[PDB]
Copies of this chain bind each other. A is one copy, B any other.
Amino acid sequence: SLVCKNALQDLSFLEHLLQVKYAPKTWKEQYLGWDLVQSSVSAQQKLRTQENPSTSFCQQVLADFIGGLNDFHAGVTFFAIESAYLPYTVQKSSDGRFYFVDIMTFSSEIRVGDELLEVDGAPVQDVLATLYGSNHKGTAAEESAALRTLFSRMASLGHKVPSGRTTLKIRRPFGTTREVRVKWRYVPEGVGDLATIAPSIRAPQLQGYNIGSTDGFLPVIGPVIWESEGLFRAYISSVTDGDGKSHKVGFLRIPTYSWQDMEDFDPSGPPPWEEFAKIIQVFSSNTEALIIDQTNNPGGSVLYLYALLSMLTDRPLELPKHRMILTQDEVVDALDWLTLLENVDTNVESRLALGDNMEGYTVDLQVAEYLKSFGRQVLNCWSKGDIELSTPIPLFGFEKIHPHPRVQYSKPICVLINEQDFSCADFFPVVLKDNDRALIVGTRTAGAGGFVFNVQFPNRTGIKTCSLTGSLAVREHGAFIENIGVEPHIDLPFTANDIRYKGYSEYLDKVKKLVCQLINND
């Protein structure tokens, strides 16, 4: 089959990429027991045993292949518009129950607070399992990612896309069970399937709960005495400990690290790191502690991550490093750095070459020194042959974060994290935890440790982008971040009660106690 031959040829290329620039390969083989060849043959078998397989089929098989790496940064997108979604958002309680927390439509028999029991006569947990990847380990993170695709399928991601209607068995809060008939919002495929066209081909002739949400879903922690009216959701409340003694506590939500994609961001007005700074000043002056909600964050720019970290300390913070796979491509970046900073010996000279700030991070002679150090280390590894999985190297050469020159929050911090924190959102709590700067609370993060790089190549299988991880992050003490993530100091999952009434009062009550203990420092 033409379609089949194309998929096998492209499968071998993706297989090849994994052997050239996939830094976590060795980790996956040892941690998951993953085997490139077997996994590859397992996919070839699915392609070869179909029957006039469709382009869609092949895309689905290739996505599962890359899906077997159990890597959030490793995936495959296709040139396919087909999709189907249901205007519902659910959240799972620590005791295994799924509740609707948001409905985006008309008074359907499904309301917020109802519990989801089945999908097409099958228990929700069993339907989710069919959405897991080949090497599913059972982490909360993989579970949640699967949940997110329960009501949002896209051919561009390799999902099977359903159409028509489906049955959801829901449970009302007063015990009434009802089977509800819902209809997928379906967008038909626009790219014609290559198999249908194959026989007619002629030889050439001449002549919110969303990840990244600004506000998040947590209700205020107590009476508000102050509130920011800018980009970020931030405010001051008064919490009374178990001794009727009031305390002023700051609350701030860091929604994403790709600052330009922030809801309501205006490229003409002042950058987001400047408004963040205005909020910290207020907090430094009028608060005794700071709660930072970092849940449901996709990550984004590292330099921005560093920018925010630099305003939450008055002492340098040690940073993790990355084991990299080097090619002459990285070597040229190294040389570019060294020449750009060649004649830099003063703070003024640093800014003249790098700018006043790098996405919020203050530029100094120290920044220029780190970057030069970075280029020298890349060049040294290259000449030493340490290029398959390099000695750990810090991004941009930054060994540590130095306190911002003007604003520095120095009181106790309590960061809230969850299974939907990836990339920089993994790093934020890692840095604060390992440097003992803050109390980490919530549930283990996703474990997406390594920078991504995308690869595009012409093909007739519909592959648009294959993204891969080019590094393996390692913490001060040796622990890898990939797949493990960051464990919180206090495991605090959401209960059925927190979710069922959308009050999260048991979660917030817990958070308030911890903070009070931080203040009273007992």
Task: Please list the residues of chain A having a beta carbon within 8 angstroms of any beta carbon in chain B.
Answer: 9, 13, 16-17, 20-21, 25-27, 30, 55, 78-81, 190-192, 194, 197-207, 327-329, 331-332, 335, 379, 382-389, 453, 455-460, 462, 464, 474, 478, 480
Closest residue on chain B to residue A384 by CB atoms: B200
- Choose among B27, B80, B456 the residue that contacts A206 (Cβ–Cβ < 8 A): B27
Name the distance in Å between A420's Cβ and chain B's nearest Cβ. Answer: 27
Report chain B residues within 8 Å CB of A389. 204-206
Among candidates B206, B207, B385, residue contacting A200 with C-beta atoms closer than 8 Å: B385
* A-B CB contact pairs (8 Å), 9 listed: A20-B460, A26-B205, A27-B206, A79-B328, A192-B383, A200-B385, A205-B389, A453-B458, A457-B457
How far, in whole Å, are A480 and B199 apart by their CA atoms in the complex?
29
12 A-B pairs besides A26-B205, A192-B383 with CB distance below 8 A are A13-B13, A26-B204, A78-B328, A190-B331, A191-B382, A192-B331, A197-B387, A200-B385, A202-B388, A207-B478, A327-B462, A329-B462
Cα(A204)–Cα(B23), bound, Å: 9
Identity of the chain B residue whose Cβ is nearest the Cβ of A200 in the assembled complex: B385
Could you say how many copies of this chain the assembly holds? 2
Return the contact of A191 from the options B25, B198, B199, B328 (Cβ within 8 A). B328
Q: Is A385 a contact partner of B202 (Cβ separation < 8 A)?
A: yes
A335 touches B191 (CB 8 A): yes
| CB contact between A203 and one of B20, B206, B382, B388 (< 8 Å): that residue | B388
Residues of B within 8 A of A385 (CB): 197-202
B25 touches A204 (CB 8 A): yes
A25 contacts which chain B residues (CB < 8 A)? 204
Chain B: CB-nearest residue to A22? B458
**CA–CA, A9 to B27, complex, Å?**
25
User: A474 to chain B: which residues have CB within 8 Å?
Assistant: 207
Contact between B202 and A458, CB atoms less than 8 A apart: no
Q: Specify which chain B residues have a CB less than 8 angstroms from the CB of A204 in the assembled complex.
A: 25-26, 388-389
Q: How far apart are A510's CB and chain B's nearest CB, in angstroms? A: 35
Q: Which residues of B contact A332 (CB under 8 A)?
A: 79, 81, 190-191, 464
- Contact partner, A329, options B13, B79, B328, B335, Cβ 8 Å: B79
- CA distance in complex: A460, B78 (Å): 27
B331 touches A191 (CB 8 A): yes
* Bound Cα distance A205, B388 (Å): 9
Would A455 and B456 count as touching, CB distance under 8 A? yes
Q: Are B202 and A335 in contact (CB under 8 A)?
A: no
Contacts of A457 in B (CB 8 A): 17, 455, 457
